[PDB]
Design a protein around this ligand. Structure first.
Ligand code: HEM
Length: 153
């Protein structure tokens, strides 16, 4: 459970992400794909991309990054009361996209890295720790839904 202070650090940097959601999404998905190539393989939509240049030029990738960040921002703003937002997501990612929880840890690391590169002043260690907790809560709650559905892993 994050404290109110922690949630404030989380949403303060997230308000900054909102100024350029598309740019953040692209950086995050590209980082995810480059750091963990197995993740790109889950996207039939994007697996044709072979280089970072191709990824940066993909408008559809940029479009999905916004989809991803929009869903995540709505979750973060619920400050833990994200049961309704997490249900459809867990269901689709477990059963449809078949995304292991480990891959959610990978994108959490990409998110934190990109937030740090773009918002050093509002993403000091205290904010990093708070965001890590927030992303951990997200993962914890998603994992519980996965386990229920028979996908814990
Ligand atoms: C911060 C975590 C993530 C969020 C908030 C998120 C959000 C979304 C949303 C909103 C959709 C569209 C609706 C849906 O299908 O549920 C989606 C689709 C999808 N996501 Fe995620 N996602 C996340 C992480 C991941 C990860 C880590 C992978 C792969 C390693 C993944 C793979 C997919 C795939 C394959 C689709 C369908 C893409 C398509 O073909 O249209 N997602 N995601």
């Amino acid at each position: 459970v994050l404290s109110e202070g922690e949630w404030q650090l989380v949403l303060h940097v997230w308000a900054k992400v909102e100024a350029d959601v598309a740019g953040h999404g692209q950086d995050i998905l590209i980082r995810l794909f480059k750091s963990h190539p197995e993740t790109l393989e889950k996207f039939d939509r994007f697996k044709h991309l072979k280089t970072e240049a191709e990824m940066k030029a993909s408008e559809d990738l940029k479009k999905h990054g916004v989809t991803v960040l929009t869903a995540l921002g709505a979750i973060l703003k619920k400050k833990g009361h994200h049961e309704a937002e997490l249900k459809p997501l867990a269901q689709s990612h477990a059963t449809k996209h078949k995304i292991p929880i480990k891959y959610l840890e990978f994108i959490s690391e990409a998110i934190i890295h990109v937030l740090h590169s773009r918002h050093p002043g509002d993403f000091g260690a205290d904010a990093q720790g708070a965001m890590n907790k927030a992303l951990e809560l997200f993962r914890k709650d998603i994992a519980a839904k996965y386990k229920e559905l028979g996908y814990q892993g």
